[PDB]
Amino acid sequence: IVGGESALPGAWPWQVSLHVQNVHVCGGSIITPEWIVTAAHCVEKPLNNPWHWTAFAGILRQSFMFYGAGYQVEKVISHPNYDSKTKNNDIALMKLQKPLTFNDLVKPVCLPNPGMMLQPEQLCWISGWGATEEKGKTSEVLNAAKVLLIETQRCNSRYVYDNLITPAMICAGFLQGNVDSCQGDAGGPLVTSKNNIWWLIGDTSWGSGCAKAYRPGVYGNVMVFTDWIYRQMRADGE
Amino acid sequence: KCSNSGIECDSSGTCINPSNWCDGVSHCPGGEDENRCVRLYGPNFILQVYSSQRKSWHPVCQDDWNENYGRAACRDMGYKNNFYSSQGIVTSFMKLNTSAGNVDIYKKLYHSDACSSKAVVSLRCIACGVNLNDDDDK
Amino acid sequence: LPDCDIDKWLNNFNVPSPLNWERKIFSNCNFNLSTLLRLVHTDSFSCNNFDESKIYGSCFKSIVLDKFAIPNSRRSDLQLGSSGFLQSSNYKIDTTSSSCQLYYSLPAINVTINNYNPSSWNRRYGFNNFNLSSHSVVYSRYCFSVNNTFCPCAKPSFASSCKSHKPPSASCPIGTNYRSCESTTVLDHTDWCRCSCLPDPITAYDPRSCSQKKSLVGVGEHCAGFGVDEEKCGVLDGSYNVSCLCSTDAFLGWSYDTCVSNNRCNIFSNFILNGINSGTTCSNDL
Numbered sequence: 001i002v003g004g005e006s007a008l009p010g011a012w013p014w015q016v017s018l019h020v021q022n023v024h025v026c027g028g029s030i031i032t033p034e035w036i037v038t039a040a041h042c043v044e045k046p047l048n049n050p051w052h053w054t055a056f057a058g059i060l061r062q063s064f065m066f067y068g069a070g071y072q073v074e075k076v077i078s079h080p081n082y083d084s085k086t087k088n089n090d091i092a093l094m095k096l097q098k099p100l101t102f103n104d105l106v107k108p109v110c111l112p113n114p115g116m117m118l119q120p121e122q123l124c125w126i127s128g129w130g131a132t133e134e135k136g137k138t139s140e141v142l143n144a145a146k147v148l149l150i151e152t153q154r155c156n157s158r159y160v161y162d163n164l165i166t167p168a169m170i171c172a173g174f175l176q177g178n179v180d181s182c183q184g185d186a187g188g189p190l191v192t193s194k195n196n197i198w199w200l201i202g203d204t205s206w207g208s209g210c211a212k213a214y215r216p217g218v219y220g221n222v223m224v225f226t227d228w229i230y231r232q233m234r235a236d237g238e
Numbered sequence: 239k240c241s242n243s244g245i246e247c248d249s250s251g252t253c254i255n256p257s258n259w260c261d262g263v264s265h266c267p268g269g270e271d272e273n274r275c276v277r278l279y280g281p282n283f284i285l286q287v288y289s290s291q292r293k294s295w296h297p298v299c300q301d302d303w304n305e306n307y308g309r310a311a312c313r314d315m316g317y318k319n320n321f322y323s324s325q326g327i328v329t330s331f332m333k334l335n336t337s338a339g340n341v342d343i344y345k346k347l348y349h350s351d352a353c354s355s356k357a358v359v360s361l362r363c364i365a366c367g368v369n370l371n372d373d374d375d376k
Numbered sequence: 377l378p379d380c381d382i383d384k385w386l387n388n389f390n391v392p393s394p395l396n397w398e399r400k401i402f403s404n405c406n407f408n409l410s411t412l413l414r415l416v417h418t419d420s421f422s423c424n425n426f427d428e429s430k431i432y433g434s435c436f437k438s439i440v441l442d443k444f445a446i447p448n449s450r451r452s453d454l455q456l457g458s459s460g461f462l463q464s465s466n467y468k469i470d471t472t473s474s475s476c477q478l479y480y481s482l483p484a485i486n487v488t489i490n491n492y493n494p495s496s497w498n499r500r501y502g503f504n505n506f507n508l509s510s511h512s513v514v515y516s517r518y519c520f521s522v523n524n525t526f527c528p529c530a531k532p533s534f535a536s537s538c539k540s541h542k543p544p545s546a547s548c549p550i551g552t553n554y555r556s557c558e559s560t561t562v563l564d565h566t567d568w569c570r571c572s573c574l575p576d577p578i579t580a581y582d583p584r585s586c587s588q589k590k591s592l593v594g595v596g597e598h599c600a601g602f603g604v605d606e607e608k609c610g611v612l613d614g615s616y617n618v619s620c621l622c623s624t625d626a627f628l629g630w631s632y633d634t635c636v637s638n639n640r641c642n643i644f645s646n647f648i649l650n651g652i653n654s655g656t657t658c659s660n661d662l
């Protein structure tokens with residue numbers, strides 16, 4: 001995260017660090033004791049083998065993420081309409097082999113419902129262990145920052161992203177920059193507060209640079225992917 | 239992709255009749271027509287069920303509604319045995335046919351015009367959305 | 377018609393530790409809440425997902441009672457949603473049900489703490505009792521589970537072929553696999569043996585080789601068992617003539633602390649309210 005501050009324990013209990021070969025690569029968001037929402041570009045082949053992924057919950061520092069403190073990922077499900085060139089439908093689910101234990105440090109975030117009636121520039125939060133500056137290294141501590149929703153019509157302007165933002169994507173951040181997700185935040189949560197409840201409205205997807213002017217962050221529209229998520233969890237219960 | 243043909247199954251553009259959506263029998267190739275028939279609406283978690291006779295979403299009457307029915311709606315949405323809260327809350331509705339048998343949950347309800355309890359069903363299938371309550375700084 | 381007598385069960389001088397917490401289901405009886413809090417030396421009584429004033433003059437299907445003594449240094453762990461040792465490794469408080477938490481105490485002079493390891497596989501391989509001072513209360517910091525095929529001793533035939541880092545060995549019970557070891561060579565050093573769960577299952581560099589798996593307790597569950605240092609199960613050059621047995625100090629990840637403050641042992645109790653306004657567990661407070 002560029003432009004954020006260090007996060008406290010329990011501030012973001014759904015945030016998880018996803019390690020491939022015990023190195024942090026992407027973030028995720030807990031929705032059920034055994035399901036985690038993340039980005040599909042994080043798990044492109046050959047990184048689709050669920051045996052390679054371990055998830056760390058409730059831990060705020062990367063050096064405290066010893067092997068064995070993480071949970072073994074059992075299954076990885078990329079969106080079947082995911083396009084790697086346009087980053088369209090950049091959403092993926094991960095199932096844990098053993099369910100988490102919820103407490104003040106590990107809690108799920110609510111999946112969004114239809115008719116949320118969000119504001120055009122609704123105040124949101126992003127979080128993750130991504131770099132704090134462009135072309136930086138994975139941050140040690142969990143960071144979080146305030147971003148505002150950017151109307152897709154404005155984000156699709158010829159001066160921002162020329163009709164590259166699809167209905168499966170939403171924009172957040174600032175058209176002046178300074179605050180944005182970055183390298184290592186992919187799959188991380190984009191959450192807002194309404195009715196005293198935190199909702200997962202986006203997963204960190206793509207963008208041009210980090211916190212640059214006219215280049216806000218693009219996130220997967222989790223509301224659009226809501227039907228697909230429910231269908232996947234419904235099938236695993238079997 | 240199914241405007242002049244029906245409702246898109248999302249199974250590579252296959253279309254079926256809107257009357258066959260959430261009608262109990264699986265027509266779509268992947269059953270997409272019979273697995274997303276129950277949802278939660280708005281920031282107040284208003285329980286809704288898609289009716290096939292009317293081809294639209296409608297809230298649920300609190301008449302004879304209990305916890306087991308809410309857990310059956312949560313299993314239908316993919317939350318498995320998870321359940322958190324359920325209560326009544328303040329025009330086409332879905333009254334609850336008690337003698338419906340061992341049928342899908344969204345079929346245990348029939349369309350009506352009013353609920354005798356005056357309240358619709360609010361449902362939360364999992365305890366989520368709670369974090370650190372920040373500070374008291376002005 | 378009969379009396380619940382909850383106060384007598386809560387005032388029994390044989391108090392368990394959080395490791396071996398006890399449970400009593402109260403059903404089909406009549407209870408007086410106001411006299412209950414009087415007969416027990418109540419310190420605090422709050423409720424979660426339930427308001428206390430609606431217990432007086434109400435019927436429930438059953439009232440489930442869990443209780444255990446409180447290690448003084450671990451009182452903060454009993455806060456709802458705490459990630460402390462008590463709820464991670466001994467008793468996880470159900471935060472979803474309608475519950476009530478009761479803190480009270482008994483005279484220390486008459487209280488005998490019952491520290492008992494509930495792990496079946498811990499007792500199978502050497503663990504007998506905690507020989508601790510009076511009023512000391514055992515709590516686990518980490519729990520580990522194993523399959524039925526578990527055994528912590530390396531095979532005597534394997535150990536005999538170790539030129540370096542020879543593991544202790546003994547015979548394992550029938551139906552249990554031996555400790556997974558491996559004869560390895562590095563540089564010119566040959567028969568350098570490498571076994572699992574090293575240095576110990578708590579700080580294991582590779583937890584995937586250790587058959588002992590970390591496990592947090594869930595609601596209604598007990599501790600799966602203390603992790604065992606497998607380098608202390610069996611003896612060096614032990615034969616098949618020696619049964620696999622771990623020493624007392626091979627069991628790790630547990631501590632203890634007294635419950636006595638102001639000459640009284642502090643006790644925790646969790647109430648579970650099942651089926652409000654339904655059942656035959658009625659209140660006589662009205």
Ligand SMILES: *[C@@H]1O[C@H](CO)[C@@H](O)[C@H](O)[C@H]1NC(C)=O
Nearest residue numbers: 335336337338339341347348
């Ligand atoms: C309830 O369902 C049963 C079983 O199909 C049916 O016979 C009955 O007519 C239904 N009642 C109403 C009021 O819909």
Ligand SMILES: *[C@@H]1O[C@H](CO)[C@@H](O)[C@H](O)[C@H]1NC(C)=O
Nearest residue numbers: 387389482483484485486487
């Ligand atoms: C506690 O022990 C003392 C001394 O052994 C005994 O006199 C006393 O009666 C006991 N307390 C109770 C409540 O029985």
Ligand SMILES: *[C@@H]1O[C@H](CO)[C@@H](O)[C@H](O)[C@H]1NC(C)=O
Nearest residue numbers: 521522523524525553587589
């Ligand atoms: C032992 O338990 C582990 C837990 O990870 C499980 O994978 C395995 O199938 C069980 N059985 C054996 C024989 O290892």
Ligand SMILES: [Ca+2]
Nearest residue numbers: 258263265271
């Ligand atoms: Ca159908």
